[PDB]
Design a protein around this ligand. Structure first.
Ligand SMILES: Nc1ncnc2c1ncn2[C@@H]1O[C@H](COP(=O)(O)OP(=O)(O)OP(=O)(O)O)[C@@H](O)[C@H]1O
Lengths: 49, 806, 626
């Protein structure tokens, strides 16, 4: 089931796929570029010993 | 001495060089003519060095060189800087213009070196310019230390050393990887230019490269055949020069092995030169390997469009310079065999401009391009064995401070010996050149270096200088040690130094403003910690000696010496140091336990001297005022509010306990630690009694000269610990200080100055207004409006009158 | 609580080794280990514990005196780091065994909630393992071995992790709102504090250039307390989260001012003018620029009561809100994130396109070269070129050369000549569709977007399988399977498209390449070349024809459908992928109501109000705009 992919701290929401939606113009959040989701994929790389 | 040489020198220095000097601003954006600019600069400098030139000719050359170098980009003058690095440390008569040029260049382009990014369009240093600058700095420093004192030479040398030190980044790691097989041909002790080609005798080309040798020989032969068919040389069934017929347009296969060496020899020499430098040439296997597996028409590979990276381009530049050096050595040998003469091209590859460099550059780029296109890759064979970067010994400031500390310690021994033997036969002590080098170089160098790099040493895990900086803990420890050594050296020697005493006190001022007490006391050498503690103790002892001498006086030597030493050195040093400590909140870090009791003695002596009713201290009451204000701002215990000091976690009475408190000379009573200093309530009672009694300034001036600045600084320090600022954990606050205290004191100040506006004007009003500037800002703005009412009243009504005031 | 004998020897060996690689990690991260004295180890006494700490079996609990050992913060950070490393080791081991992350734990499906990065690891378990490790390392530290943790080295990551083509986004008013004269005011609220700029921009301002880097913009940068028109100068102070920057422009006096929470910002001098001498120059429009993970809000003062500090500063000085006398919201234009193909400008810095007319012995050509090659500041990055008109495949697929065959054929040809000295491995030749928008600095044929639609019967047997992509191209280097110098003759890749069957084939130097593509009916293919320039001359489109194949013009132009003579009409030009474009934010959006109904019903998404826009379609480029 698709709910099992929620990260432990986050909560599941259904939201817009895009950043901008129907709002008042002066209250609309203009967003810059976003950081890449590095925590999305957990690849455990240890220190080579 | 030939007539042609003299006339040519006259022509140049009279018509050509002044013209270039006037057209100097056109030399600004000429970034695409580096070879031409280098040729011009090196020719002008090599002309400036000479014996057939008059003073006017030398002056014209100096003006032209300075004007052009002031407009050129920093990257264009690297080769000139190399010649300067070799020639300047001699410190001859011919070095004065070089020193001036270096001073101007580094002063202008310090950002190009110091900042991690540098000038935006110009860029940053290539680490080779940084190594060159560090080498120049140390060469000049050592040569000046050895050199006998000369006025003009030293006056020109100090700015150059200071500018280079300021331009170099303080944390510049010395790259232990020195320039590998750097060419010495350009740089020679005798003469200007001695061609020294790279040795190729013992280098053997690997059998792996024989295929490349054969292929490049075929390419060279095919291109030659194209050129011969182009100028019209007909195929040579037999040679005939008149009919323009050449037998050598047959294919390379039909060329003979004895003949093939004419083409393979330059290729072999080039490959031997490349291998001799340690470069590795290695095959990319797939392409050339399958090239192995699988009526003359001239058709050669066209490598015009194929490009090279920057690293391989520098490779090609080195190879072209080596080709020029080989040809220059051969031609020099030919000219020497002829017995005389001089070819115009017997100059360094740097001095050569683009048109001459074109052929050698074409040769080197051609061989490298063929290597790339065949698949072979060229790279530096050498790899740095170990980075050795975190080791702060390589850091430039580390060695600079080590040398500065060594020179200060030596000077300390020197003045100690002179004090021991001043009345002996040796009126001129042996160490005259050394002491004069110290006084005239080391102190101003420290002064300007710690002006320039203040933030770097103060930088810690805190914000300041976030871009690049953060001097090491050992570096800060050496800063503190240098400050302590300078203080102990200046103690009681203002008479000996005289004019120098100003230099030492300025150095101490700026070093104290650059001290990092927190980090030094937390992680630092016990010797340095004890040195700082002893410096504070010595200041306390000298202040106490001055205090007792004031009472013992009234008759006017040691008395005059100690009084003038106090007034000249001790008050400024203490003022600056305590101001720095208060600004950086270091008092909690360093002023504890024995340091705190020494500061208690300092405070008692300062108050006694300031309040003393003596004509001797009347002239110096002000400086005591600034010193006492700085101490009030720095000292971490609320001394005025002595009834509740048990809440102060930083207090001797709460930390060092009764046994050790009695072992030290302490009253055991917080009300008795400073008996002669009234409490804050008593001080405010005095202040409210004044400005209503109507006292004049000269009636009793110590209040508004010394006591009031203390009150302002004490308010400023101890108001943010107040209970109005701490409704949380109230009555555990160390102070009962309040904004009502703040505005009451400010209003009393206004009333005092307003009563005194009519007569007794002086400048103490502006002094005290400066002291009250920090007490104004923390006052609430809402009351500050309608609190400026007296301010605007008496800024015009009593200020603007017949009498001049403020 | 068992002696090693009966205790699982696998568990005890795991303990011994994990301690062995634990010291190995200690030395690997850079810690210096030194024994002061073996007798220093001996002197400190081991506790023998009473029966409460004493276990049952007899493996006597013997802790050494750890009361007096305290660690420096570098050593404590080392403890944290090696605990993180141990977590990574364990997670990698379980992943190799086959365990995956799940929001709950399921042993049957091999799913664990703990398989997450150490930063996300739960505090209780992470601190328990951390303190066990801390006690373990403290034992050795008190065993006479001082462990000098290497000094922490600060690294600046610049907090940039965005898409490879975007480092900032620029928002501005529409060009038509440019103010030539008057006194104007607007506000910019900074939800975050970081890489952000705000000010006034001329209409020609570019969306991919930093604000104030060039003359087109006058901006204030409160991240570093700077002002930017042509370069940067120190000005003002830095904002914080929630601050408001009021921007004032006065075209009459040609001045600009900035206020931070009402207070006027001033430069190194006492001047209140950020910029004081500029021409009117087609007016100015409000503009802002936001970096990675930056959030802003721009208020043009359509409702004056919503301006935070206009009354405090700006009102009494005669400045008007930018939207003081407007009835509808100001149209907002923001930098386009998706690159588009557009004609190479005649004033482009690097790319030059030359049109060569076809002679009797030569076909028409379009040569792509480099202006800035062989000089400094020359961009060495892959450029994506295409031809402005597509070839459309047949809408239904059927299941001296001959003039009749040439007339009846639906096969078209073009060529690309990679010039001598240009690396074939850096040149890709083939076809693209209008859906291609993938600007990547590193382009390889293996990362082209692709999919396969597999249609089967009711049983499940696959009866058809369709491969779909937007990039049908080959590499000149691999097509030149034999490696040579390429300067003997310039390399010439021929692209052949049979539109009646949707078949794409390639020719190396007269030899047909093994790479071929099959496309769906009605597919529109643009001739395309992707090239990284290693030469002043890059490549050459050639519009000629080969035997039994029509030229490109015949397929492109209906009026030339039957003309075998190759043609290069002026309508056909060379376009390149670029980011210099703006996107128009819609004035109104769809109203979507989303709400969690219940744990059983799920998440309701509701949209009922119709909303429409009028789309203008460009037939050439197979694209549409608002
Ligand atoms: N606190 C502990 N420290 C060290 N080893 C432990 C600890 N607790 C249990 N062990 C040992 O670890 C093993 C099982 O615990 P562990 O957390 O390693 O399981 P796992 O199989 O890796 O986990 P999972 O199913 O979550 O992937 C046993 O050998 C047990 O003795």
């Amino acid at each position: 089931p698709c709910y099992e992919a929620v990260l432990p701290k986050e909560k599941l929401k259904v939201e817009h796929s895009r950043e901008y939606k129907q709002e008042r113009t002066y209250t609309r959040d203009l967003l810059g570029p976003t950081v890449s989701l590095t925590q999305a994929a957990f690849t455990p790389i240890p220190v080579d010993t | 001495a030939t007539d042609m040489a003299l006339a040519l020198n006259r022509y140049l220095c009279t018509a050509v060089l002044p013209l270039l000097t006037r057209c100097a601003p056109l030399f600004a954006g000429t970034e695409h003519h580096a070879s031409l600019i280098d040729s011009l600069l090196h020719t002008v400098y090599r002309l400036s060095k000479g014996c057939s030139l008059t003073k006017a000719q030398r002056d014209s050359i100096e003006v032209c060189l300075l004007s052009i170098c002031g407009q050129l980009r920093p990257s264009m003058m690297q080769h000139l800087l190399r010649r300067l690095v070799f020639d300047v440390p001699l410190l001859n008569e011919h070095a004065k213009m070089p020193l001036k040029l270096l001073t101007n260049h580094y002063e202008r382009c310090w950002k190009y070196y110091c900042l991690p990014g540098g000038w935006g369009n110009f860029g940053a240093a290539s680490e080779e310019e940084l190594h060159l600058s560090r080498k120049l700095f140390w060469g000049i420093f050592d040569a000046l230390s050895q050199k006998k004192y000369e006025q003009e030479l030293f006056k020109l040398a100090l700015p150059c050393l200071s500018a280079v030190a300021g331009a170099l980044p303080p944390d510049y790691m010395e790259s232990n990887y020195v320039s590998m097989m750097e060419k010495q041909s350009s740089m020679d002790s005798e003469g200007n230019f001695n061609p020294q080609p790279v040795d190729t005798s013992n280098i053997t080309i690997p059998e792996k490269l024989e295929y490349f040798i054969n292929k490049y020989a075929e390419h060279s032969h095919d291109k030659w055949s194209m050129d011969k068919l182009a100028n019209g040389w007909i195929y040579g069934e037999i040679y005939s020069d008149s009919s323009k017929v050449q037998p050598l347009m047959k294919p390379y296969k039909l060329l003979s092995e004895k003949e093939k060496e004419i083409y393979r020899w330059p290729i072999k020499e080039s490959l031997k030169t490349m291998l001799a430098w340690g470069w590795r040439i290695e095959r990319t296997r797939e392409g050339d390997s399958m090239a192995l597996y699988n009526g003359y028409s001239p058709r050669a590979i066209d490598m015009s469009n194929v490009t090279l990276s920057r690293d391989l381009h520098a490779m090609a530049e080195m190879m072209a310079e080596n080709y020029h050096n080989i040809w220059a050595k051969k031609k020099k040998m030919e000219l020497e065999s002829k017995g005389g003469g001089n070819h115009p091209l017997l100059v360094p590859y740097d001095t050569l401009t683009a048109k001459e460099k074109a052929k050698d550059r074409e040769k080197a780029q051609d061989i490298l391009k063929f290597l790339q296109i065949n698949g072979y890759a060229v790279s530096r064979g050498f790899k740095d064995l170990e980075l050795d970067t975190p080791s702060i010994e390589k850091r430039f400031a580390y060695s600079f401070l080590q040398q500065l500390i060594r020179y200060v310690d030596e000077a300390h021994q020197y003045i100690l010996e002179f004090d021991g033997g001043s009345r002996g036969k040796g009126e001129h002590f042996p160490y005259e050149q050394e002491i004069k080098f110290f006084a005239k170089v080391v102190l101003p160098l420290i002064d300007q270096y710690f002006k320039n790099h203040r933030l770097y040493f103060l930088s810690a895990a805190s914000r300041p200088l976030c871009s690049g900086g953060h001097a090491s803990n050992k570096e800060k420890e050496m800063v503190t040690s240098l400050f302590c050594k300078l203080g102990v050296l200046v103690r009681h020697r203002i008479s000996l130094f005289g004019n120098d005493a100003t230099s030492i006190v300025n150095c101490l001022h700026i070093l104290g403003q650059t001290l990092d007490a927190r980090t030094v006391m937390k992680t630092g050498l016990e010797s340095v910690k004890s040195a700082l503690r002893a410096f504070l103790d010595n200041a306390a002892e000298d202040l106490e000696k001055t205090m007792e001498n004031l009472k013992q006086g009234q008759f006017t030597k040691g008395v005059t010496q100690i009084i003038n030493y106090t007034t000249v050195a001790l008050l400024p040093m203490l003022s600056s140091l305590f101001e720095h400590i208060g600004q950086h909140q270091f008092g909690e870090d360093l002023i504890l336990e024995d340091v705190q009791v020494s500061c208690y003695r300092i405070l008692t002596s300062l108050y006694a001297l300031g309040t003393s009713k003596s004509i001797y201290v009347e002239r110096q009451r002000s400086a005591l005022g600034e010193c006492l204000a700085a101490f009030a701002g720095a000292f971490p215990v609320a001394f005025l509010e002595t009834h509740l000091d048990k809440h102060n976690i930083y207090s001797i009475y709460n930390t060092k306990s009764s046994r050790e408190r009695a072992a030290l000379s302490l009253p055991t009573n917080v009300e008795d630690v400073c008996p002669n200093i009234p409490s804050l309530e008593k001080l405010m009672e005095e202040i409210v009694e004044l400005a209503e009694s109507g006292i004049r300034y000269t009636q009793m001036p110590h209040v508004m000269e010394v006591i009031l600045p203390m009150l302002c600084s004490y308010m400023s320090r101890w108001w943010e610990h107040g209970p109005e600022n701490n409704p949380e954990r109230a009555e555990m606050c160390c102070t009962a200080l309040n904004s009502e205290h703040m505005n009451t004191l400010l209003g009393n100040i206004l009333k005092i100055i307003y009563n005194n506006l009519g007569i007794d004007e002086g400048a103490w009003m502006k002094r005290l207004a400066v002291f009250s500037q920090p007490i104004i800002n923390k006052v609430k703005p809402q009351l500050l409006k309608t609190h400026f009412l007296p301010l605007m009243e008496k800024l015009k009504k009593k200020a603007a009158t017949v009498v001049s005031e403020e | 609580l068992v002696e090693f004998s009966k205790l699982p020897e696998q568990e005890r060996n795991y303990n011994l080794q994990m301690s062995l690689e634990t010291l190995k990690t200690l030395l690997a991260l850079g810690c210096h280990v030194g024994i002061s004295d073996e007798h220093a180890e001996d002197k400190v006494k081991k506790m023998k514990l009473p029966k409460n700490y004493q276990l049952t079996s007899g493996y006597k609990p013997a802790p050494m005196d750890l009361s007096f050992i305290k660690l420096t913060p570098s050593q404590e950070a080392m403890v944290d780091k090696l605990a993180e490393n141990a977590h990574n080791v364990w997670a990698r081991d379980r992943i190799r065994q086959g365990w995956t992350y799940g929001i709950q734990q399921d042993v049957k499906n091999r799913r664990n909630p703990r398989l997450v990065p150490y930063t996300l690891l739960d505090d209780r378990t992470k601190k328990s393992n951390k303190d066990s490790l801390r006690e373990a390392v403290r034992t050795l530290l008190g065993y006479g071995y001082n462990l000098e943790a290497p000094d922490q080295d600060h690294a600046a990551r610049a907090e940039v992790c965005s898409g490879t083509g975007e480092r900032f986004r620029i928002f501005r008013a529409e060009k038509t709102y440019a103010v030539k004269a008057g006194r104007w005011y607007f506000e910019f609220e900074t939800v975050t504090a970081g890489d952000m700029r705000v000010g006034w921009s001329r209409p020609g301002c570019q969306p991919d250039q930093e604000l104030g880097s060039d003359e087109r913009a006058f901006a204030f940068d409160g991240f570093k307390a700077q002002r930017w028109h042509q370069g940067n100068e120190h000005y003002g102070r830095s904002w914080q989260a929630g601050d408001v920057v009021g921007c004032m422009v006065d075209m009459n006096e040609h001045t600009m001012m900035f206020t931070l929470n009402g207070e006027i910002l001033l430069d190194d001098s006492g001047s209140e003018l950020a910029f004081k001498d500029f021409d009117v120059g087609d007016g100015f429009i409000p503009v802002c620029s936001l970096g990675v993970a930056q959030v802003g809000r721009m208020n043009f003062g359509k409702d004056v009561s919503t301006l935070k500090y206009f009354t405090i500063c700006g009102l009494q000085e005669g400045y008007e809100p930018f939207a003081v006398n407007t009835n509808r919201d100001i149209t907002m234009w923001l930098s386009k994130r998706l690159p588009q193909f557009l004609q190479v400008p005649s004033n482009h810095e690097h790319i030059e396109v030359t049109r060569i007319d076809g002679t009797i012995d030569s076909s028409p050509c379009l040569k792509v070269t480099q202006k800035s090659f062989g000089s400094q500041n020359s961009n060495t990055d892959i450029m994506f070129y295409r031809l402005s008109m597509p070839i459309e495949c047949a809408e239904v697929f059927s299941k001296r050369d001959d003039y009749d065959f040439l007339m009846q054929t639906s096969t078209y040809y073009y060529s690309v000549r990679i010039f001598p000295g240009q690396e074939p491995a850096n040149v890709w030749v083939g076809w693209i569709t209008s859906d291609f928008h993938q600007y990547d600095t590193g382009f390889d044929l293996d990362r082209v977007r692709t999919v396969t639609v597999t249609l089967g019967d009711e049983k499940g047997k696959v009866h058809e399988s369709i491969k779909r992509s937007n990039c049908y191209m080959v590499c000149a280097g691999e097509s030149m399977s034999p490696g040579q110098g390429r300067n003997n003759n310039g390399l010439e890749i021929g692209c052949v498209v049979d539109a009646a069957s949707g078949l794409l084939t390639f020719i190396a130097n007269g030899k047909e390449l093994s790479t071929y593509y099959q496309v769906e009916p009605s597919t529109k293919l643009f001739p395309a070349v992707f090239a990284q320039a290693t030469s002043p001359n890059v490549f050459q489109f050639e519009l000629g024809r080969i035997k039994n194949v029509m030229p490109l013009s015949a397929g492109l132009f209906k009026s030339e459908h039957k003309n075998p003579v190759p043609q290069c009409p002026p309508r056909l030009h060379v376009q390149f992928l670029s980011h210099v474009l703006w996107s128009r934010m819609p004035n109104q959006f769809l109203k979507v109501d989303v709400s969690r109904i219940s744990e059983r019903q799920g998440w309701l998404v509701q949209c009922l109000d119709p909303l429409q826009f009028m789309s203008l379609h460009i037939p050439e480029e197979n694209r549409s705009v608002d």
